[PDB]
Design an enzyme around this catalytic site. Structure first.
Site, PDB file in Angstrom:
ATOM      1  N   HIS B  17       0.826  -1.186   0.000  1.00 42.52           N
ATOM      2  CA  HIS B  17       0.000   0.000   0.000  1.00 42.52           C
ATOM      3  C   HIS B  17       0.858   1.232   0.000  1.00 42.52           C
ATOM      4  CE1 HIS B  17      -0.268   1.163   4.598  1.00 42.52           C
ATOM      5  NE2 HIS B  17       0.890   0.558   4.352  1.00 42.52           N
ATOM      6  N   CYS B  36       6.040   6.437   4.505  1.00 44.87           N
ATOM      7  CA  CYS B  36       4.820   5.713   4.107  1.00 44.87           C
ATOM      8  C   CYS B  36       4.129   6.247   2.845  1.00 44.87           C
ATOM      9  CB  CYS B  36       3.824   5.738   5.259  1.00 44.87           C
ATOM     10  SG  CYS B  36       4.475   4.881   6.647  1.00 44.87           S
ATOM     11  N   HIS B  44       3.523  -4.912   3.917  1.00 43.47           N
ATOM     12  CA  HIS B  44       3.470  -5.525   5.246  1.00 43.47           C
ATOM     13  C   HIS B  44       2.947  -6.951   5.184  1.00 43.47           C
ATOM     14  CE1 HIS B  44       4.072  -1.538   6.853  1.00 43.47           C
ATOM     15  NE2 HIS B  44       3.008  -1.109   6.188  1.00 43.47           N
ATOM     16  N   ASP B  82      -5.349 -10.645   0.539  1.00 45.81           N
ATOM     17  CA  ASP B  82      -4.071 -11.340   0.561  1.00 45.81           C
ATOM     18  C   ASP B  82      -3.385 -11.304  -0.791  1.00 45.81           C
ATOM     19  OD1 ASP B  82      -2.010 -12.989   1.917  1.00 45.81           O
ATOM     20  OD2 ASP B  82      -2.732 -14.526   0.527  1.00 45.81           O
ATOM     21  N   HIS B  83      -2.102 -10.926  -0.770  1.00 42.58           N
ATOM     22  CA  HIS B  83      -1.269 -10.783  -1.970  1.00 42.58           C
ATOM     23  C   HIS B  83      -1.881  -9.797  -2.931  1.00 42.58           C
ATOM     24  CE1 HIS B  83       0.938 -14.231  -0.358  1.00 42.58           C
ATOM     25  NE2 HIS B  83       1.916 -13.851  -1.151  1.00 42.58           N
ATOM     26  N   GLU B 127      -0.063  -4.066  11.780  1.00 46.12           N
ATOM     27  CA  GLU B 127       0.633  -3.622  10.575  1.00 46.12           C
ATOM     28  C   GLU B 127       2.073  -4.089  10.617  1.00 46.12           C
ATOM     29  OE1 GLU B 127       1.151   0.604  10.210  1.00 46.12           O
ATOM     30  OE2 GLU B 127       0.900   0.604   7.954  1.00 46.12           O
TER      31      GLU B 127
HETATM   32 NI    NI Z   1       2.376   0.821   5.508  1.00 41.10          NI
END
Ligand code: NI
Ligand SMILES: [Mg+2]
Ligand code: NI
Ligand code: NI
Lengths: 138, 138, 138
Positions: B17, B36, B44, B82-83, B127
């Protein structure tokens, strides 16, 4: 319209201490605190989890500015406690027993001086992996 | 009356992300989100603990069968997240900032679209090992 | 100033068990509990976190003496459960399904036979790293 959430950051610090009360006899202190009363001290890698709470800010997506929390924990925990002897280097513990309970309360009180009112929810201190204290300001 | 209990299941998922808002400028996103906000993203291994609550069934001993809770979690968390790249592959995050707070709310809401009424108590998202959000639908 | 706090201690124990209900047929038991219904059993390294609460005593700086907590936990958890087959060696589970929910309740109840009134706050049982139950006496 809005969501409340709890946000936590974990850090650790190293410190040494000795458990003793200036009000009790040497024999009482040994009976009560056992090996933790060792005259030259012992130590821990403390872990601290600080939890704040509040509304998720719709503009930023955060309860609190994360940088600010890093700064606040650095100022309230790391600077005064890390690589220190609690009973000799931290003035607060001159007259207070350095139990994990009292370390949690000290950390809470230090954080409440920096943090916006009503935002601090919980302080959790691990003296070891197996021994934990949680203080919520009650 | 019969006993009430909380039952939890922990899973993890991998996602990438980027933290940025549609409402703020390039200068502002960098100041607020720092590293970030890296244009090409970061990622993550998220860990999620989902807790449900209720009466312990007196014939089966279960608040909820862990095999059911795994299926709900597979549908509400693994399949969509996921992924994946959150901001590009999950439509919800097209106009919501993918902070861990908003991920916890997204998971709560998905779980509620999939679960029997009234069973969800808490969603906790790690996270990283050190950065946690807890959302309880409040 | 009086300050309330939560204090937790974690231990583990090894036990085997088998999940089944006398109110279900073999087929139903197999359908409900799946591999947990294996006739010769299976097992776990259970982890238990016991949390007590109360006032921090100004003299000793503790809510509860650790030595006592360790004794209570040894008597309420280790002696009856450790290196045991739950369903065959623990009379309580002769007529109660040994789900993790019922193990938490059992531990809670045992602890209440020996803790002072008003001190027990929470019993948390990890059947595995990823499957957790929390019981608070509700
Ligand atoms: Ni992050
Ligand atoms: Mg919602
Ligand atoms: Ni110590
Ligand atoms: Ni099992």
């Amino acid at each position: 319209r809005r969501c409340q959430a709890q946000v936590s950051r974990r850090i650790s610090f190293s410190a040494s201490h000795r458990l003793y009360s200036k009000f009790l006899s040497d024999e009482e202190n040994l009976k009560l605190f056992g090996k933790c009363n060792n005259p030259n001290g012992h130590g821990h890698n403390y872990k601290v989890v600080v939890t704040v709470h509040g509304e998720i800010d719709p503009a930023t997506g955060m309860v609190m500015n994360l940088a600010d929390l890093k700064k606040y924990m650095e100022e309230a925990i790391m600077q005064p406690l890390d690589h220190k002897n609690l009973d000799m280097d931290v003035p607060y513990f001159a007259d207070v027993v350095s139990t994990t309970e009292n370390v949690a309360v000290y950390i809470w009180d230090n954080l409440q001086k920096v943090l916006p009112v009503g935002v601090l929810y919980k302080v959790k201190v691990y003296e070891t992996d197996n021994n934990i204290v949680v203080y919520k300001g009650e």
